Amino acid sequence: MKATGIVRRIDDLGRVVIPKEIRRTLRIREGDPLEIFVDRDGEVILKKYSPISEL
Amino acid sequence: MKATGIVRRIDDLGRVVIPKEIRRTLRIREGDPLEIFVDRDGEVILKKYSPISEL
C-alpha cells in the first residue's frame, strides 16, 4: 500500500507535479524515469523504469 | 492491470508529464485532481481524487 496521499490537480498541461520527496524516497533525481501506466480506473502508476517495477 | 507503459524521465522539476490521452480516458481535463501515492517501491499511483479511487 505505502501511500502518501497528496492530491494534485494536474495543471494547464497535464503533468502531475511529483514532489522531490517521493523521488527522494526513490533516492533518485531530475533524471528518474517512470512508467506511466494506469492500473484500474483513473489511478496512474508511475514506475522508475530503470529497474522496471522489480526486475 | 490496464497499463499504458509510457516511460517519462521526470524533468528539472519532478513532474510526470501525463499525456491528455490518459486524462481523456479519465473524461477529465486541466482540472483533474489526482492522488499521488506510491504503491510499494517506486510506483506512484495518481488517482482522480474526486471519486477517490472507487468511492
Swiss-Prot record, chains A, B:
Biological role: Transcriptional factor that positively regulates or negatively the expression of a large number of forespore-specific sigma G-dependent genes. May provide a mechanism of feedback control that is important for forespore development. SpoVT levels during spore formation have a major impact on the germination and the resistance of the resultant spores.
Superkingdom: Bacteria
Name of the protein described by the UniProt record: Stage V sporulation protein T
Induction: Expression is regulated by the sporulation transcription factor sigma G.
Entry similarity comment: To B.subtilis AbrB and Abh.
Included range, full protein: 1 to 55 of 178
Domain SpoVT-AbrB: 5-51
Phenotype reported upon loss of the gene: Deletion of the gene leads to aberrantly formed spores. Mutant spores release their dipicolinic acid (DPA) via germinant receptor (GR)-dependent germination more rapidly than wild-type spores. Spores are also more sensitive to UV radiation and outgrow slowly.
Domain characteristics, as noted in the entry: The N-terminal domain binds DNA non-specifically and the C-terminal GAF-like domain is crucial to its correct folding and function. The non-specific DNA-binding activity of the N-terminal domain is modulated by the C-terminal domain, which perhaps in combination with another unknown factor, confers activity and specificity.
The protein's assembly and partners: Homotetramer. Two monomers dimerize via their N-terminal swapped-hairpin domains. These dimers further associate into tetramers through helical interactions between their C-terminal GAF-like domains.
